[PDB]
Design a protein around this ligand. Structure first.
Ligand SMILES: [Br-]
Length: 270
């Protein structure tokens, strides 16, 4: 003597929410006759819920999600799911844990001193200063003395072809920004992971001088992470995450997202 299909549910909170912001929907039971309402909201965490019997025999439901991601709202009437139920809700916001490692090189001065080496002998090496002046460099180990501050470009060629790692950049002085677009990344840790199993990827910033590279994993639990600078100038990153869920791995170079960052990374259980 009730009819679940006559139950109507509407409102933004049926499809969309935001972290620490109330999401709301109306349950209209007026045409459903006799029967009880049961309601649950399942997702990354349990969600506080409020209801208000409105004047017009309607019931306003208000919920507050504390963690982003994919939720579902179960609405049953007389132990039967109503039309549209369960409703998929996507909740945007900051993951609850953000785990980052951020690698920086600073070199705040220029000084006409070639007492160092910051950078099979038929090799041509050229350097282009920030002001665009290109000049040939002596030669492993390139001897060029920057006179200018800013991002330099450095190309090393054998037979007139670039070697491994060339062309690259060499920034001296105060960092500010820029260069994120030319940064590269790849590895399975950038599209999926398994809880408790290391997930790797590599980064090539092509920056031989000053720069800042921030790798972050944001999502429902803690991460263990490791980072290695490699001989070739690349970066290895590995992370182990504690719980299954939807995570975000972001690579920022001098404060800007590299081209596919942040990468959505579903993490499965063991
Ligand atoms: Br990799």
């Amino acid at each position: 003597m009730g009819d679940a299909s006559r139950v109507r549910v509407s409102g933004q909170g049926l499809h969309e929410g935001h972290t620490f912001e109330p999401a709301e929907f109306i349950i209209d039971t007026r045409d459903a006759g006799y029967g009880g309402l049961s309601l649950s909201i399942e997702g990354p965490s349990k969600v506080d819920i409020n209801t208000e019997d409105l004047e017009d025999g309607t019931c306003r439901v208000t919920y507050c999600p504390t963690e982003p991601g994919n939720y579902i709202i179960n609405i049953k009437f007389a132990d039967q799911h109503v039309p549209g139920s369960p409703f998929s809700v996507k909740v945007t916001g900051e993951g609850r844990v953000k785990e980052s490692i951020t690698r920086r090189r600073r070199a705040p001065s220029v000084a006409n001193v070639g007492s160092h080496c910051d950078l099979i002998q038929d090799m041509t090496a050229q350097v282009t200063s920030p002001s665009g002046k290109t000049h040939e460099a002596e030669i492993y180990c390139i001897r060029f003395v920057p006179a200018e501050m800013g991002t330099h470009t450095v190309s090393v060629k054998y037979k007139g072809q670039h070697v491994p790692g060339s062309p690259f950049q060499f920034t001296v002085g105060p960092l500010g920004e820029g260069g994120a677009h030319k940064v590269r990344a790849g590895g399975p840790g950038l599209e999926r992971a398994e809880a408790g199993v290391p997930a790797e990827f590599s980064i090539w910033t092509r920056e031989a001088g000053a720069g800042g590279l921030a790798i972050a994993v944001e999502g429902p639990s803690k991460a263990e992470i490791s980072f290695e600078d490699r001989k070739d100038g690349s970066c290895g990153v590995a992370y182990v995450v504690q719980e299954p869920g939807d995570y975000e791995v972001s690579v920022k170079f001098n404060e800007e997202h590299i081209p596919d960052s942040p990468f959505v990374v579903p993490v499965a259980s063991p």
